[PDB]
From a paper:
BAP29 and BAP31 are two homologous membrane proteins (∼50% sequence identity in humans) that reside in the endoplasmic reticulum (ER). BAP31 controls the fates of its bound clients, which may be either retained in the ER, progress through the secretory pathway or be extruded and subjected to ER-associated degradation. The structures presented here now show for the first time that the vDED domain adopts a dimeric coiled coil fold with no structural similarity to DED domains.
The vDED domain forms an uninterrupted parallel coiled coil dimer in both structures. Apart from that, the two structures are however quite similar and exhibit a RMSD Cα value of 1.12 Å for 94 aligned residues. In the P21 form of BAP31 vDED, residues 204–233 of two dimers interact to form a tail-to-tail four-helical bundle across a crystal contact. This dimer-dimer interface covers an area of 2900 Å2 and is predicted by the PISA server to be stable in solution. For comparison, the radii of gyration (related to and numerically similar to the Stoke’s radius) of the dimer and potential tetramer of BAP31 vDED were estimated to be 29 and 39 Å respectively based on the P21 structure. We therefore conclude that BAP31 vDED elute as a dimer on the gel filtration column at pH 7.0. We therefore conclude that the observed tetramerization interface is unlikely to be physiologically relevant.
Residue numbers in the entry:
A (entry chain A): 172 to 233
B (entry chain D): 173 to 233
The structure:
């Protein structure tokens, strides 16, 4: 029984391992998406700031 | 044959712990990232509002 019990437990733990791996994969993709969004918004912030600057430049030339 | 199964059992438990922790970390980082996204959206809105006000001021000639 020692060995059959160990088999039961091993299969169970392997299943748990797979479940956790799935969770980690999902969460990882979510994190990747959020990070990439952050970068995107850095670029966009830079651009928008540049346009705000264009306001001042153009006005300085009237 | 038993010692092998014991070995594997412990190995699997260790892997479990590692994954619990890695998942916890990843969730923390996801939370941080989403707060960053939110904050930056708000900064952007503030900036477009600033833009509107400034342009409206310039258009007053």
């Amino acid at each position: 029984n020692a060995e059959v019990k160990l088999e039961e437990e091993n299969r169970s733990l392997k299943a748990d391992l797979q479940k956790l791996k799935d969770e980690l994969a999902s969460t990882k993709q979510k994190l990747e998406k959020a990070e990439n969004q952050v970068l995107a918004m850095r670029k966009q912030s830079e651009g928008l700031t540049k346009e705000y600057d264009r306001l001042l430049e153009e006005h300085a030339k009237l």
